[PDB]
C-alpha cells in the first residue's frame, strides 16, 4: 500500500504537536500511533507522520527529518510574526537538504481562532502564492482546517 511520509515543521510553540494529535485522535477527549491508515480518494494509504517538536533547535536532526520527508506541513502561529518568517528559513533549508526547488509543502496558519492576530491572512496568502504552495488556516481547538491541511499535503505529494 502507498505510504506518505509527512513532516510537521515550524518554530517552538506554534502548535505542531496539537495539530498532529488532532489528526491522529479517533475520539474526542476534553498513546496513539503516527502511522495512520486512511482512505483518500478511494485508495487505502498510510500517513507516516513525523513531528519535529522537541528538536526544532537541533540542526543535524532537523536535516534528517528533511531528508526522509516526502512533504512538509510548514506551520506558523497567526499571533507570532517570528514564526511566520521562520517558514522562509525552513523552506530554504528543505530546498538545500533535498537539492530541489519543487518539494511538496503546505503553508499552515495555526491558532486561527485566537483574537491576538499579528500576521494578516492576506500576507500569508501572498507568501503562499510566491512559494507556489497551498495555504490553510487551522485551529485544533475549534476543529477547523486540520483534516484539510493534511489531505491537501497528500494531494501535493501525489501531483509531484
Amino acid at each position: 500500500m502507498t505510504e506518505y511520509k509527512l513532516v510537521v515543521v515550524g518554530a517552538v510553540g506554534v502548535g505542531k504537536s496539537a495539530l498532529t494529535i488532532q489528526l491522529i485522535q479517533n475520539h474526542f477527549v476534553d498513546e496513539d500511533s503516527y502511522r495512520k491508515q486512511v482512505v483518500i480518494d478511494g485508495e487505502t494509504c498510510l500517513l507516516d507522520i513525523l513531528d519535529t517538536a522537541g528538536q526544532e533547535e537541533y540542526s543535524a536532526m532537523r536535516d534528517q527529518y528533511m531528508r526522509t520527508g516526502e512533504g512538509f506541513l510548514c506551520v506558523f502561529a497567526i499571533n507570532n510574526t517570528k514564526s511566520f518568517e521562520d517558514i522562509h528559513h525552513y523552506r530554504e533549508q528543505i530546498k538545500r537538504v533535498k537539492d530541489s526547488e519543487d518539494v511538496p509543502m503546505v503553508l499552515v496558519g495555526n491558532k486561527c481562532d485566537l483574537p491576538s492576530r499579528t500576521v494578516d491572512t492576506k500576507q500569508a496568502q501572498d507568501l503562499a502564492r510566491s512559494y507556489g504552495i497551498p495555504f490553510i488556516e487551522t485551529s485544533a481547538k475549534t476543529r477547523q482546517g486540520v483534516d484539510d491541511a493534511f489531505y491537501t499535503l497528500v494531494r501535493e505529494i501525489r501531483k509531484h
Binding site: 517570528k82 518568517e85 530546498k95 526547488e101 502564492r129 507556489g132
Partner: protein
C-alpha cells in the same frame, strides 16, 4: 547589558520607525544579524517595510549582506514581490547577479514566484537570465 542589535532586529520586523531610529541613535549595529544571518535590512525587505528599508540604507546598512543561505535583501524582496523595495536596493548598489547557496539569482527567484515586473526591473539593471530561470504563475521597450 541589553543587546541593541536584537532590539533593532525586533523593531525592523515590526516596521516600528520610531524604535529603529531611536536604537540607531543609541549606536545599535545596523548590520547586526540573527542566528540565520538576517539583518534589519533582510527583515525590512522580506516584510515589505519600505520606509524602514530607506532609513537603514541612509544609515549605512550593507545591501550586500548574505545570510546563512547566501540570500541578500534583494533575493528576499524579489522572491516575495516587493517591487519598490527591489528598486531602492538596486539604487543603493545591490549586486543584481548575487547568487545564494543554491546558485539562485534574485531574477531566478522572482521568475519562479511569478513576479514579472520584478524580473523586468532586474533585467533593466543588468541581470543575467538563462533557460533555467523558469516562470511560475504570473519597461519592455527598454529591455528589448
Amino acid at each position: 547589558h541589553m543587546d541593541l542589535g536584537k532590539k533593532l532586529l525586533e523593531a525592523a520586523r515590526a516596521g516600528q520607525d520610531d524604535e529603529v531610529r531611536i536604537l540607531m541613535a543609541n549606536g545599535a549595529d545596523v548590520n547586526a544579524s540573527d542566528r540565520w544571518g538576517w539583518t534589519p535590512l533582510h527583515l525590512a525587505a522580506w516584510w515589505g517595510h519600505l520606509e524602514i528599508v530607506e532609513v537603514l540604507l541612509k544609515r549605512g546598512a550593507d545591501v550586500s549582506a548574505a545570510d546563512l543561505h547566501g540570500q541578500s535583501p534583494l533575493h528576499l524582496a524579489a522572491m516575495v514581490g516587493h517591487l519598490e523595495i527591489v528598486e531602492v536596493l538596486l539604487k543603493y548598489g545591490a549586486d543584481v547577479n548575487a547568487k545564494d547557496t543554491m546558485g539562485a539569482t534574485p531574477l531566478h527567484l522572482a521568475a519562479r514566484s511569478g513576479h514579472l515586473e520584478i524580473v523586468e526591473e532586474l533585467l533593466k539593471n543588468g541581470a543575467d537570465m538563462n533557460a533555467q530561470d523558469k516562470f511560475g504563475k504570473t519597461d519592455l521597450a527598454e529591455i528589448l
